[PDB]
Amino acid sequence: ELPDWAAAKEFYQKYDPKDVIGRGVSSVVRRCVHRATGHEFAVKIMEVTAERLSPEQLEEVREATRRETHILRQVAGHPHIITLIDSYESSSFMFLVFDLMRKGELFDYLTEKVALSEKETRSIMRSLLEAVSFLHANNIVHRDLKPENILLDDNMQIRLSDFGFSCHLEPGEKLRELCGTPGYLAPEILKCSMDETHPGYGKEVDLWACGVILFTLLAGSPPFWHRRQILMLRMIMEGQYQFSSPEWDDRSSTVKDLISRLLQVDPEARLTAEQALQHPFFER
Amino acid sequence: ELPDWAAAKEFYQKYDPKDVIGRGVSSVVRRCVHRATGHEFAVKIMEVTAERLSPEQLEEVREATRRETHILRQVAGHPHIITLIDSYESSSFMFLVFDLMRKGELFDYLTEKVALSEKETRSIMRSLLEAVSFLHANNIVHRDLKPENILLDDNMQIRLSDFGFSCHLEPGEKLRELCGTPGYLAPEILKCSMDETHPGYGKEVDLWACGVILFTLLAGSPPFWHRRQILMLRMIMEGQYQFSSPEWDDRSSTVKDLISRLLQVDPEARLTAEQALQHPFFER
Amino acid sequence: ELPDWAAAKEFYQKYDPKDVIGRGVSSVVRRCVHRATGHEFAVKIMEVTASPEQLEEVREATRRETHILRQVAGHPHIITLIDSYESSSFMFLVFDLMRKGELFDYLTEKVALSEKETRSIMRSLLEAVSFLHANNIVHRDLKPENILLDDNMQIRLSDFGFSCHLEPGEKLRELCGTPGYLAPEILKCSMDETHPGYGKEVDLWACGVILFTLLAGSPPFWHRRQILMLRMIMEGQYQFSSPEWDDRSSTVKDLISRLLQVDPEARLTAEQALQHPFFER
Amino acid sequence: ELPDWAAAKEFYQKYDPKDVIGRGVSSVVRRCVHRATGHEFAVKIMEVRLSPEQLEEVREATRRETHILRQVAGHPHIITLIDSYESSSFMFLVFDLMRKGELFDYLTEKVALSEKETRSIMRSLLEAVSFLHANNIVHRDLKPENILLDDNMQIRLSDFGFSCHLEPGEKLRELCGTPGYLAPEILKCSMDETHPGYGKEVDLWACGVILFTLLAGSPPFWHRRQILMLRMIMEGQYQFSSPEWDDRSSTVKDLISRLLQVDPEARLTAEQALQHPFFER
Ligand SMILES: CCN(CC)CCNC(=O)c1c(C)[nH]c(/C=C2\C(=O)Nc3ccc(F)cc32)c1C
Ligand SMILES: CCN(CC)CCNC(=O)c1c(C)[nH]c(/C=C2\C(=O)Nc3ccc(F)cc32)c1C
Numbered sequence A, B: 001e002l003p004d005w006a007a008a009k010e011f012y013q014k015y016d017p018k019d020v021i022g023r024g025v026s027s028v029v030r031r032c033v034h035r036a037t038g039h040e041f042a043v044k045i046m047e048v049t050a051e052r053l054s055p056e057q058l059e060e061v062r063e064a065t066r067r068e069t070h071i072l073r074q075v076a077g078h079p080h081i082i083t084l085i086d087s088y089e090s091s092s093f094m095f096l097v098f099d100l101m102r103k104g105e106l107f108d109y110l111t112e113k114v115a116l117s118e119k120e121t122r123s124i125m126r127s128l129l130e131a132v133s134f135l136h137a138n139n140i141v142h143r144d145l146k147p148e149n150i151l152l153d154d155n156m157q158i159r160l161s162d163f164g165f166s167c168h169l170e171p172g173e174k175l176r177e178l179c180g181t182p183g184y185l186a187p188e189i190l191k192c193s194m195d196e197t198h199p200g201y202g203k204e205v206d207l208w209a210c211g212v213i214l215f216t217l218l219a220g221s222p223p224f225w226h227r228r229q230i231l232m233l234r235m236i237m238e239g240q241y242q243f244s245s246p247e248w249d250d251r252s253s254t255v256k257d258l259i260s261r262l263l264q265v266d267p268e269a270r271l272t273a274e275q276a277l278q279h280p281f282f283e284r
Numbered sequence C: 001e002l003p004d005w006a007a008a009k010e011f012y013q014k015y016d017p018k019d020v021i022g023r024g025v026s027s028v029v030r031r032c033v034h035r036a037t038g039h040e041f042a043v044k045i046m047e048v049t050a051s052p053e054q055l056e057e058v059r060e061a062t063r064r065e066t067h068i069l070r071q072v073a074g075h076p077h078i079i080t081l082i083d084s085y086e087s088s089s090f091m092f093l094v095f096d097l098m099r100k101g102e103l104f105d106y107l108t109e110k111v112a113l114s115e116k117e118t119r120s121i122m123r124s125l126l127e128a129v130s131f132l133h134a135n136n137i138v139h140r141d142l143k144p145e146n147i148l149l150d151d152n153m154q155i156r157l158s159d160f161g162f163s164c165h166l167e168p169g170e171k172l173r174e175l176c177g178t179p180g181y182l183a184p185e186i187l188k189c190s191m192d193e194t195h196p197g198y199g200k201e202v203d204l205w206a207c208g209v210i211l212f213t214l215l216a217g218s219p220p221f222w223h224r225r226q227i228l229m230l231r232m233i234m235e236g237q238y239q240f241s242s243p244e245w246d247d248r249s250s251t252v253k254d255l256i257s258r259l260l261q262v263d264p265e266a267r268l269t270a271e272q273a274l275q276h277p278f279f280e281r
Numbered sequence D: 001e002l003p004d005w006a007a008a009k010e011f012y013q014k015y016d017p018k019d020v021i022g023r024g025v026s027s028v029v030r031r032c033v034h035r036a037t038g039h040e041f042a043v044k045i046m047e048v049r050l051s052p053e054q055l056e057e058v059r060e061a062t063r064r065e066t067h068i069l070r071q072v073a074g075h076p077h078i079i080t081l082i083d084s085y086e087s088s089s090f091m092f093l094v095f096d097l098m099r100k101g102e103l104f105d106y107l108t109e110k111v112a113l114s115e116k117e118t119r120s121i122m123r124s125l126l127e128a129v130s131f132l133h134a135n136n137i138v139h140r141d142l143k144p145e146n147i148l149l150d151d152n153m154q155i156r157l158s159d160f161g162f163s164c165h166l167e168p169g170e171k172l173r174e175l176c177g178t179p180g181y182l183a184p185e186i187l188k189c190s191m192d193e194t195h196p197g198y199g200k201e202v203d204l205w206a207c208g209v210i211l212f213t214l215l216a217g218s219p220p221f222w223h224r225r226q227i228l229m230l231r232m233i234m235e236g237q238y239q240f241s242s243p244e245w246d247d248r249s250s251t252v253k254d255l256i257s258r259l260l261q262v263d264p265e266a267r268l269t270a271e272q273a274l275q276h277p278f279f280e281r
C-alpha cells in the first residue's frame, strides 16, 4: 500500500543489497546487510509488473503474494521454516527480507553429494516433517515441497521456503487447484485435475512429496520419471516405483518401510507428519 | 537375414543418398536417387544399435521394427498410404526406401497457410478417412494420426506415414498401451490409463484423431490445448472444445457437424471411417 | 553520485515501472509511465553492483555514453535520452519507447525485407549516420539489434555504448563493435601499433553489412569459426548467392559493393551513399 | 576412392557398429566391435552442398590428417588410427575407444580438477606435444575437447584436423584453431603480412590455456563480446580470480604464467615445461 518511492527509499536506506544468490521469473534473491548493525540477510525483490499481464491477471498475482506474506507472518518463528524478517511493499514491487541460508538449496547440495547417507537424510527429514506437522496443525498446506524449496545453513540445518503455492485449508474441506512440481505431485492431485468427479485433495499431498524427497535424497534420482511426462503420470497414479538393486542395496529396510508408508496412493492409508515422526526410522 | 556388410552394399550400390529431409532418435530420412535411372525416393535409415540399451530392450526395438515393416508391406499399394518400395534388413540397420513426398508434412503446410479452406480440407480428409477405412478393414490401428504423419506431394495428394505405433487388432480385441501424441489421444485411451477396470480401446481412437486433425486444419489451432499438459487431458476426457467466434465464423455447419460426430467421447457413438465418408461434408 | 536510496526514490517517484521489454548482462529495459503526464517511455536500469577501480571505469564509460546521447537528442532517427538518475550501484536511463522493438527481431519475423522497405530503413539510417559524423561522433556498433522501430515503422539508432568523439584528421584504435560488422581497418589496426588507425568510415562498412543482411536475411561474412570470418572481412569476400539474391536489383548490389569497400578512402561516405541512385524517389 | 558400397562393405564386414558416443557437423562417432576378436573401438564416420573444387579441398585435408595419424600411431598418449575406409561420400576412421570420453565433458562433470589429477593429465599432454614437435608436427588445435580419457584416467591427444608438418626454422601463417586457445603471434601475423609467422610454440600457449581451464573450470580469455576476447589474448590479460584460484598453489600459477607468455621466444618449450617443479614429483 506504500508508494513505490517509499518502499524503495525505506529498503535502500536500511539495507545494503549485495551478491545475487538466486533468480526467478519476476524476482531475484540477493544477500544484503542491515546498514545499522552490519548483520546479514537475504532479500527477495519481487517485480510485480515485470511481466506483461491483463489487469485481471495482475490482481490475481497481487492477491496471491498477499496470501503468501500473510502465511509467512503466521509461521515466522518456527526453527525449520524460513523467517520473514522485514517487508517493504508497494504496488510495483515487494522487498522481502529473510534469513540468509548460506549453504543454499538442498537440491544443489544433493547434486554435489550425488546421494546422501541415512544419518544426514534422517536429520533433514525429521526437521522437514516437523515443519510440515506445524503447518498442518495451523491448517496450512505447502503444496510444493521439493529439494529446491528446502534451504540449508552452515550447520546443515534446514529451513522450508517458497510458500507461493501454500494456502489455508479448513479441516474437512478439500482443494482442487493443480500446482506444484509434476514429479512431486500426489496421485489424488492428478486424479483430481484429470477427473472432475474425484473428491479433491488435502494436507496428505505434502506427505507424498516428503516421500518423493526422502527417496530422491537416498537414491540421487526421483522414484517417478520418464522421457515422456504423460507416461510419468500413470507411474505416479499407480504408485509404480522400485528400490533398484545398485543404489538401494545397502539402504535399511526401516527407511524403505517409511518411503512405502509415505508413497501410499490412498491418502487415507497414508502417514500423517506426526505419524511419520513417530516412525522407527527417527528412533536412530 | 543379411549380414551388415550385405545390407549396406546392396543399398549403396543401388541408391545414392542425398539431403536430409527428416531426423529421428535412431533414424534419419534422406532423399535418395536410384543410380541407374536417376529417379528419386526417400530412405529411412534406422540405426537399431545407435542407443545404448539392455539386450532385452534391443530385442524389443528389433521386434518393434519387424512389426512396422510387416504392416508397411501389407498396406503397400494403397494410393493414400506411404509405399515401402524396397528394404535392406540386417542386425544393426534397416534401410527403408519409400515414395518421396516433395511438399513434406501436412503440419508444415498448415503452419505456412495458417488455416485451410473447406475445399482443400475436404480433399485431405476424404483421402485420410479412405486410408483409415482400409487399415481398419485389414485389422490395423495406426495409433498416431496427426498432420506431422501425413505427407504431401506436388499435386497436394496425401500419404499416411509413421506406422511405428501401429499394430494388428483382431476384431473385438482391445488395447491399453498409451502411445501417440497427447493432443490427438481419444478419451478412452486416457480413461483406461488411470482406471484399470475400464475395458480398453479399439480402432475408434484413430477417428477421434481424425476429428482433431479436421478441427486443427480449419482453425489453425487444436481443439484441446493448455500450457499444462495435465489440464489438456481433462479437456480431452470431458470432450471440452468450442467453435470460437473469430475463426469458426464463416465455416459451414456441415463441417462443424462432422467434427462433433468425430469428437464424440463415447467410442460406440463415434463415427466409423466408412460412416464419416458417407457424411454430407464429403458430397461431390 | 547520490546514495542508492535517493536515485531509486527520484526515479520511482517520477516514473511507474512496467513490463520488461529487453535484457542485457548488467541491465534490464522496461516500459515505464511518467506519473504526472501518463506518457510512456522505456527505462534502461544498469546495475553496477551486479574491483572499485573497474566499477569506476564502468561509471566513467556510461558518463561518456550519456554525454554523447545528450548531444544527439532531438534527431528524429536517433534514440532520445529523456532523463537519467545516478547512484553508486544504479543508473536509470529514460528513453523513447520504440513499440516495434529491434529491427533484428523484425528481420527474424519477416526473414528478408523488400528493397522498398529496406530503402526506407537505409535512408533513415544513413541520415542518422551523416548527422553523427557531422557532429564528429562515430557510433562503432551499427547493427540491426541497435536499430529500434516504432508503430509507423520509423527507425531510431540506439546503443551508443561504443560511440565516441572524433576530431577531423584524427584516428581511433580501440577494437570494439560486433565482429560480423567490423571494418577491415579495425582488424588491421588492432594488431600493428604502427598502423595509422580508423575513422568514421567504419560506420559505413557496418551500414553495408546491415543493407546486405536486411535483403539476404543472413550476414555477408559468416561461418561457425569466428577466426575464418575475420579473413573474409579483411579480404572483403562476400557473394550475392543465387537463391536469395536472384530477385535483387543491380542498383542495390552496386550500393552494397560501394559500402563493402576494403579501402576506407575508396568507400562511400554517408552523404555519398544518400546520393546513390538507390535513394532517388 | 572406392565406390560407396565397397567402403561400407569393408567397414561393416570387419566391425559391428554400436551406440553413438559423439557428434560433429559432418560426422558421428560410434562405439564399434571388431567382429573377429570382440575388441572394442570407436569409429568416426565422416559424410559430405559444396563446389567440386571445395569438395576436393575437404578430401585433400582429410588425407593430410590420416597421413599425420599414421606417422604418430603407436605413441601411448596420442589417438591410434586402427583402420580407415574411404569413398566419394564417406570416410570410416577406426580409433581407440576412450571410455571416459572428452576431457572437456569430464571437466564439466567435476567443475574443476585437483592439482594431483591436472599434473597427471598435463605431464602426458606435454609428452605427446614434445613427441609431435620432435617429429616436426604442430597440432594447432589443443583443447580439452581434443583430449580423450580412458577408465585409468590416461589421456590420448586427438583431432589432428588442423595439424601440419613444419620444417625446422620455417614458420606458419594460417589462422586456425579455437579462438580461446590461439597464441598472440597467430592473431598478430593473420593481420600483418610483414610479421614473421608462428611455430610449434603456439601448442604450448594452448597447453597453458588448458592447464588454467582444468583448474579454474573456465578459460583465461573469455568475454560476452568475442572481439574483446581477442584483445585479452594479444595483451595476455588473464587473472587468478579469488573464489576459484583461492586453494591453488603458486607453483602451478608459475607454470601457467611461463606457458601464457606473449613472447614465443620467452615461452616454455614442452621439454622445458616438463622440467618445471610442478612435475618434479
Ligand atoms: C555461487 C555458488 N552457488 C551454486 C548453485 C550459488 C547458488 N545459491 C546459493 O548459494 C544460495 C544461498 C547462499 N542462499 C540461497 C537462497 C535463500 C536464502 O539464503 N534465504 C532465502 C529466503 C527466501 C528465498 F526464497 C531464498 C533464500 C541460494 C539459492
Ligand atoms: C529442407 C530441410 N527440412 C528438414 C530436415 C525439410 C522439411 N521436410 C521436407 O521437406 C520433407 C520432404 C520433402 N519429405 C519429407 C518426409 C518423407 C518423404 O518424403 N518420404 C517419406 C517416407 C517415410 C517418412 F517417414 C518420411 C518421408 C519431409 C519431412
Ligand SMILES: CCN(CC)CCNC(=O)c1c(C)[nH]c(/C=C2\C(=O)Nc3ccc(F)cc32)c1C
Binding pocket: C020, C021, C022, C023, C029, C042, C044, C079, C095, C096, C097, C098, C099, C100, C101, C102, C105, C148, C158, C159
Ligand atoms: C523481453 C521480452 N520480449 C521478446 C521478443 C520483448 C521484445 N522487445 C520488444 O518488444 C522491445 C520493445 C517494444 N522495445 C524495446 C527496446 C527499447 C525501446 O523501446 N526504447 C529503447 C531505448 C533504449 C534501449 F536501449 C532499448 C529500447 C524492445 C527490446
Ligand SMILES: CCN(CC)CCNC(=O)c1c(C)[nH]c(/C=C2\C(=O)Nc3ccc(F)cc32)c1C
Binding pocket: D020, D021, D022, D023, D029, D042, D044, D079, D095, D096, D097, D098, D099, D100, D101, D102, D105, D148, D158, D159
Ligand atoms: C551422446 C554424447 N555424450 C555427451 C555428454 C557422451 C559423452 N562422450 C562419450 O561417451 C564419448 C566416449 C566414451 N568416447 C568418445 C569419443 C571418442 C573415443 O572414445 N575414441 C575416439 C577417437 C577419435 C575421436 F574423434 C573421438 C573418439 C565420446 C565423445
